[PDB]
Design a protein around this ligand. Structure first.
Ligand code: LDA
Ligand code: LDA
Ligand code: LDA
Ligand code: LDA
Ligand code: LDA
Ligand code: LDA
Ligand code: LDA
Ligand code: LDA
Ligand code: LDA
Ligand code: LDA
Ligand code: LDA
Ligand code: LDA
Ligand code: CL
Lengths: 97, 98
């Protein structure tokens, strides 16, 4: 694996709390198919089933502002909070910067 | 059970290209340990080993600017580009409903 973890949560009524595991795959060398040809699947074919749309939109939402960075040992995460629709969201992101 | 896909890539020399699969787990009901207690690992224990630090920094880099949205059928993705260090990165993120 190449893997990092993020966290995401809502405020208010019906607040949700999600762990999200980001698995990275390098596309520099593609896999082979049964005929020995390069298989381009990993470059365009998305995984599924997807989580609820408001959760995906919340996690992927563009937001430039960082409320602050947390740290313990040599692990640093950044916390962001923002509104999508009428819901307030927080996400916590690995940030080795 | 619950998964979305994003794409990440560099411009220029030693330009890289990554698929990132995002696996979501709902933490509302924790799993049980062998003695019947609630196990809190999923709320704080990060997965690993991690990809290169510059790759993580680039994918995670906060950024509010969207160069544009791409669409086919009922699938919409947003494309963002920005500089990290001396490298220009693009990322493609699933974005309902834009
Ligand atoms: C070694 C024991 C560690 C246990 C610490 C548990 C404290 C977490 C409490 C979560 C509180 C949620 N909230 C939003 C009110 O902060
Ligand atoms: C295979 C049926 C359709 C052909 C798709 C082949 C796409 C070639 C893409 C070139 C990109 C190669 N590279 C090294 C950047 O990964
Ligand atoms: C049957 C499907 C055929 C798909 C062929 C798609 C060709 C895409 C080539 C990748 C382009 C690389 N680059 C740098 C210009 O983005
Ligand atoms: C740089 C990535 C370019 C590779 C993209 C290849 C897209 C091929 C889509 C072909 C559609 C397959 N099918 C089964 C619907 O015919
Ligand atoms: C169904 C969703 C389709 C997603 C396909 C996205 C392909 C991204 C192509 C990026 C390639 C850029 N570059 C420079 C490596 O060629
Ligand atoms: C720079 C290369 C561009 C690659 C873009 C390839 C897009 C393929 C989209 C296939 C999705 C069609 N589908 C299944 C959603 O209907
Ligand atoms: C080493 C990584 C440390 C991660 C820190 C996680 C912080 C989450 C804080 C949520 C509670 C915020 N507040 C306002 C109640 O303090
Ligand atoms: C060994 C220490 C374990 C302490 C467990 C921390 C309890 C925090 C509870 C947070 C509640 C989250 N949720 C969704 C289950 O409600
Ligand atoms: C609501 C968020 C839940 C946060 C709860 C975090 C539990 C952390 C427990 C850490 C214990 C590690 N230790 C010291 C036992 O090895
Ligand atoms: C070093 C890993 C850091 C552990 C990350 C802990 C994330 C906990 C975030 C607080 C959860 C807020 N809430 C509402 C569920 O209590
Ligand atoms: C909002 C309250 C939740 C805060 C929980 C943050 C947990 C930090 C876990 C760091 C793990 C430390 N250690 C030694 C087990 O690696
Ligand atoms: C389902 C929609 C997915 C469309 C994703 C297409 C993104 C590929 C962009 C690569 C380069 C675009 N370009 C050459 C115009 O700059
Ligand atoms: Cl993000």
């Amino acid at each position: 694996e190449a893997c990092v973890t993020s966290w995401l949560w809502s405020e208010g009524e019906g607040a949700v709390f999600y762990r999200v595991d980001l698995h990275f795959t390098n596309l520099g060398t593609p896999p082979l198919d049964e005929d020995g040809r390069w298989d381009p699947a990993l470059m365009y074919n998305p995984c599924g089933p997807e989580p609820p749309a408001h959760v995906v939109r919340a996690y992927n939402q563009p937001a430039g502002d960082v409320r602050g960075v947390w740290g313990k040992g040599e692990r640093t995460y950044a916390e962001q909070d923002f509104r999508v629709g009428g819901t307030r969201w927080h996400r916590l992101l690995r940030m080795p910067v």
